[PDB]
Amino acid sequence: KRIPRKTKGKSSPATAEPGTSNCEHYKARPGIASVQKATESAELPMKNNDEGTPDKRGNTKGALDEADDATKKQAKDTEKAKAQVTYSDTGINNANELSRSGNVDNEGGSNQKPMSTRIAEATSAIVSKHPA
Amino acid sequence: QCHVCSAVLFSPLDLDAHVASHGLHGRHITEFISSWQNHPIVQVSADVENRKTAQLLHADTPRLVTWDAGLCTSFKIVPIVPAQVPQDVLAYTFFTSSYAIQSPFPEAAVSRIVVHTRWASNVDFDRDSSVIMAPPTENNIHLFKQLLNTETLSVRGANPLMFRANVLHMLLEFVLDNLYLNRHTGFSQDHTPFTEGANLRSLPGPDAEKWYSIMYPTRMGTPNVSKICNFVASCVRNRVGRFDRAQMMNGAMSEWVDVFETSDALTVSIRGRWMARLARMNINPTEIEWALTECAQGYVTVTSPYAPSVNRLMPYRISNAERQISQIIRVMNIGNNATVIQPVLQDISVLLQRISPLQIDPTIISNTMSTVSESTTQTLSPASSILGKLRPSNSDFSSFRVALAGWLYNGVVTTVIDDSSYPKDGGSVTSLENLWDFFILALALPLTTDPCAPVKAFMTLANMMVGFETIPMDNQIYTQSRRASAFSTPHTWPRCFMNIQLISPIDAPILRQWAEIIHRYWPNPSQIRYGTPNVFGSANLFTPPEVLLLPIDHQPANVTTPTLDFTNELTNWRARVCELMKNLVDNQRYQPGWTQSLVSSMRGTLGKLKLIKSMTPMYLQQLAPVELAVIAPMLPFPPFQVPYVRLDRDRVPTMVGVTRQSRDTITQPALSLSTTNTTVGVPLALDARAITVALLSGKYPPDLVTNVWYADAIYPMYADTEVFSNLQRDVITCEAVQTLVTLVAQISETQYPVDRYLDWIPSLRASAATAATFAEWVNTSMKTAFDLSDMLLEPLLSGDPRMTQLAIQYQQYNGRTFNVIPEMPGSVIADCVQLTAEVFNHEYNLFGIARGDIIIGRVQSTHLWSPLAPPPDLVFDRDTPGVHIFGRDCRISFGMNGAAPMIRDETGMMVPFEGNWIFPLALWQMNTRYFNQQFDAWIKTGELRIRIEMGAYPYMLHYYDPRQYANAWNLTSAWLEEITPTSIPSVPFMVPISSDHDISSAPAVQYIISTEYNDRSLFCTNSSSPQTIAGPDKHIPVERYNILTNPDAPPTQIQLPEVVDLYNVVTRYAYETPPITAVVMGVP
Amino acid sequence: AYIAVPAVVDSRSSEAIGLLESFGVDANDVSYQDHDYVVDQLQYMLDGYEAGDVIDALVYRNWLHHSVYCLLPPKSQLLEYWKSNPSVIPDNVDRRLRKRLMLKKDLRKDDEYNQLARAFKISDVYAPLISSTTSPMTMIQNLNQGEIVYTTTDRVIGARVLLYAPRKYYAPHSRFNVGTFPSIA
C-alpha cells in the first residue's frame, strides 16, 4: 500500500445478549457538541510568524499595525463592532517595542535592494572580457 | 458487541477490524468510548478525503514510522562502455528445459560504482529527499551548485567557495532519505544445485527471479572461466539467505528475521540507529492510562485494556529537555506580534466559557437595586448612576474569562486594566461618578496579572483625594496629582506606599487606611498541581515541573459554602472596599456642594453591594483552578509562567530574554525581540466594568453536581487531544535544532566542540547572510523530509543563526537574573551525518569528488596508464627541486625586442614562461582571459606545466579507444575557457578502455592528470573474460565482500569508517501501531 | 506605508489620472486616498480657528487608522428624537430619564421630567464629545484613539461627517497608500 504525501517536495446458536440496547436516554449537561466545537477551535496550532526570515534565494521574505489588526480581529470574533479586549492604544507606553520586519537582513543592513541583486552587482563589478 | 471496550457495533462481520485496535487478531488515530452514554468519539487525520462523523487532528504530526520492503542499499553498480564476448557455457540444462545464466554484476568492459539512494526500494510515503547521481560519463555538476549559486555568472559551473556547504547539504539529504524501518516479507525455499536448502527472501511484485539474481551473488554457479566466476568460487556458500528467525509467531510468519542480502553498511547502520531511537522512544498503554487518569484530577477514571504483545509500537516517551527547547522555540516565535497570541487567548476564553458552570447574570444587580429609588424633586441620584455605569443590559463578558485565560501566560502577555476606565481627568472625591469609577476600578484590579496593580489602586485614591489630603513627596518633580496609569513599572513605587508609617494619620487618615487595607488584605498567590509529570513531559520552566502558579489562592472545592464567607479573600476585599468607601462618605468632609444629604442613600447602596448573592468569588476560589489545571496539559501552547509576587518590589520580574550563545564566549550582544517591553510581556488592555459586573453577579444552576458535570465535560475534551502529536513535533524540533547547530558550526567559525571530518574541501568563513540561507535550506530540507507544513526552527533564522545553545532568562528588579540552560541529549540526525561524513572522507570518489589537485601539461605518450592513477615521475610536489610557487601578486611583463616574457614569482623573482609551476586556483579564477590569453598559447606546444592546487573538484570521465589517435586539447581548452570568477566546470579526464585481446598502439595527447590516486569507484574491468591484458587492471574488490571471502569473519563484522561493505546482515521487523484507546469511566 | 504628494488625491479620478506618472514615479499595489472633503473641511474651519493650529493638529493626525464623526442633534432635539423613537435610547442614560421618555402624555407641564431635562447634560451619555470649544488637537487625537467620535458642531476636521438622527432634528489598505497630507504620527 501507499500513503499520499501532504506537502510537495523535490518537484521536478448465536443470539443477541440482553445487555445491548440503543436508547440515548441521557442528554449531556455541558453539551457534547458545544464543548466539542470549543475544543476544535482551541486545538488549532499557533499561527506561523515568517517575517524577517530568509528564503531559498537568500532574500528576506518578510513584508516591508499588528496591534490594530489584532484589535480588529478581536472585534470580528466578537459580535460588537467595539472591542472590549484590545492590544492597541492601551495605557502602558511601549514605544520601544520592535517587531520582526523585512526591512533588515541578517547582517543588520537595509533591504532597500535585495541580497540577490546586491550580490549580482558586486560580482559583476569586475568581470573580464575577451580581447578585441 | 465487543467484550473488551464495550463498543456496540451493528456489523457482526468486521469485529476483527475493531479488535485489531485492542491487539487481537481475527488511518485511525484514537478511539474513545464513554461509560454512561452511547456516543463514541473518533479522531481522524486532518487531510482525509471525507469525514463521516469523525473529528480532524489540526496538528502537523511528523511521520516517524515509515516502512521499506525493497533493498537496504544506496550504492548501485552501473556499466559503461558495454561489450559482449563469446562464452563457453551458454545456459543451464535440466531434463528437457533450459535456464539462462544471470550474472549478479553487469557484464561490460568497465563497471564502476555510483551512489543512488533507494534505487531498489518499495516504500510507502517516500521521504522524497533523494540524491541522484548520474554515471560519471555524464555531467554530475548539477548538485554541487544547488545551494548558493543563484547568482552565478555562468551555468554548468559550481562554486569552489561553496563546495563544502553543498557537500554538507548533500550528505544531510542522503542521511534524511534513509529514515526507514525494514519490513519483513515472505521467503521462498530454494532448491537450486548451488544454493540448496536455503531460504531466499522475495520482494513483493510481479516476479522475483531477477531480484534473486541481483541480491544473491553466490547463486550463480561457475559455468565459465571469468572474473565473476572466480569471485564466486572464492566466495563461500554457507552464508546466504535467512540467518535465524525469532521465536514469537503470529500464525506461521516469523516475528523478526535477519537475512544475508546485498546491502551497504552505512545505510543499515543508519537504520539501526533509527530503530534503536524509536525503540527507546516507545510507550505502553498502561502508563498512558495512568497519565490520563492523573491529568483528569480524579474527576474521571480512565482504563485501556490490551493483549500481551511485544511488537506493539507507539513512540511518545520523551524527556523534559525536548519539551523545554520546544517551549523556548514557541516563545521566540512570537517576537512581539499581537496577531500570533490573540487567537489563543480568544478561543481559550470561549473554551472556559463552555466549560465553567458559572453563568453570569446582572439581573441580580438589577433586582437588588430595583427597590432603591429616589425622590421626584432632588436631581442627583446614586442608584441611577450605579445602574447606568454598571450597564446591566450588556451581555459581553469576554474580558473576565480572557483574564482567567491570561493568568497562565505571564512573561509573554500581561493583562492590565484598560485606560479610560480610570476617572476622567485627575478625578475628584466630590463627584459621585468619579467615586464609583474608583469603586469599580479598585474592585477590578486584583484579577489582572500586573505587578503594579496595588500601586495603581493606591494612586487612584491619592489622585482623587488631591486637594483634601496630603502625602509627602521625595524628588519634588512627581506631584501627588500624577495619574495612576503611569505607574506601570516597579521603579515608580513611592516610599509612602513602601512604608505605611510615612503617611501621617493626623493629616491623611483615609489614605492611611487605604494603604493599610491594601497591605493587609491583598490576595495572596498560591500554586496548584496540573498534568502528569512522569509519562508526559513538562514544558514549563522557571517553576518546578508540576505546579501552576495562580495570583489567587485556592482551597478544596465544595459547593455548600456560605456566600458571605469573609474568610474568602475576594469577599473580604469587596467588604473592606465598601467599608472604607462608606467611611469616606460619612463625614461629608470630602463632598462639599452636595446640598442634599446623600449619606443615607450612599451607605444603603454600599451595604447592598457589600452583601449580595454572588457565587463568583467562591467559583474563583474553588472550581476555576481545577478547570485551569484540567485544560493546561492539553493546550497546543503549554503554559509559560513567571513567579508571582505581591507588595515586594525586589522579586518583581522586568524582562524576559532568549540567548543563542554559550556561557564561555564573549560575543557581540544581540538581545532578543521580547526584551523590548515596558512590562514583562506584550500589554493587553482589559475593561474593568465587565470584570466588576462578572465578579459581582454570578450564580450556579439549582441542581449542580460537580462530579457529574465535570465527568460530562472532560470526556469530549479528552477525546480531542493532540498531546502525542505535540510530543512527536517537539522531539523533531529538538532534532532539527541539534542538526542546525552542528551544520552551522561545521562551516562557520564558532567555538562549538565538534569533530571536523571534512575540512580539505575549500570554502569560506560564512557571514550572517550565508549562515542564514544555509540554515533556511537545512530547515526546508527537514520539513520536506518529515512532511510538516507549520513552523519549524524559523524563529532561529531571524538575526544571527550562528548559534551554540538555547537558553532563556528573566531579570527581576534588584538585578538577580535567573538563567535556565536546558541540557540537550545526543541526537540522531547529527551523529548520523557525522558518521556519513567520516565515511565520506575515506570514500569521496563514490559521490563523485576527487581529492587532491590536477596538473596541466602536455604528455605525448603511447602508454596506457590511467590519468586518475599517474606514475610518480609525471607529478611534482611543493618540495620538488626546481619549482616556482606563486602568490596573489603575480604580474606578467612582456619581452621587448624579442625576449621571453616573465612572470613575478612569489619570492619576488621573475621567471620565464617555461618550467614546472605551482599555481593556486584562486589566481586563475581571478585573472582568466589574461592568464588564459597567454598560457593557453604557451601550454599547447611549449614546456610550461602548471599544477593547479584546489583541494577537491568534481570530475567527469571521457572514454576513448586506445587503438586510435586521440587528443584531449579540445577538452582541456574547453575547461580552461569558461572557468569564470564565480564558478568552475567539472574537470574533464580522458581515460582509456581496458581490453582483453592484443590491441594496436596509437599515440595520445593528455594534458590534465590527477596528483594522487582518485579512482576507487572502479568496480571491475572486463568482467566477462578470464583476464585483462591491455589497460587498467582491476578485479572484483574482495575487500568490500568481506564476510563471503574472509573465512574467520563473524557475520556482524564491518569496517565502518574505512571501506563500506556490501552484502551485509540486515534485520527485518514487523511492528503493529494500534490506535490509542481508552474507556472513559465515571467517578461517583 | 504612507506617501504624501502635493496634489488633490481622490479615489476614482486620481486613480484614473494616477499622478505618479505625472510626478515622474513609475508605478494593484498602490491605494489612493480621498482628501477633497478634508480640503473643504480645512477651508470651513479656517474661519473660527487659526491656520497654524489646524495645520499642526492635522499633521499630527494619521491616515491609516479609519475613523468617523457623528453629529448629535442639539439637546432639545436629542431628547425629542429619543422620545419619538425610544428603542434607540442608549443604556448609559439614567433609569428615571429613560423610563419617563418611554411614556405617553409628555408635555411641558411635567415637573420632575423638566427637572431631569435641565439637570441633564451630555457628559455621560456620549463619552468622547467634541463640543464647540474643543481645541483642534484634542479632536484629532480622539479620531486616532477610537473608531467613532461624537461631535456637536459641524465645524470639524477629520474622516467623515454622519448624522446621528434624521435630518429634520438638525437645524482599502494596500502595500503603499498615497495621499496629499503628510503625517508625522
Ligand SMILES: [Zn+2]
Ligand atoms: Zn473493542
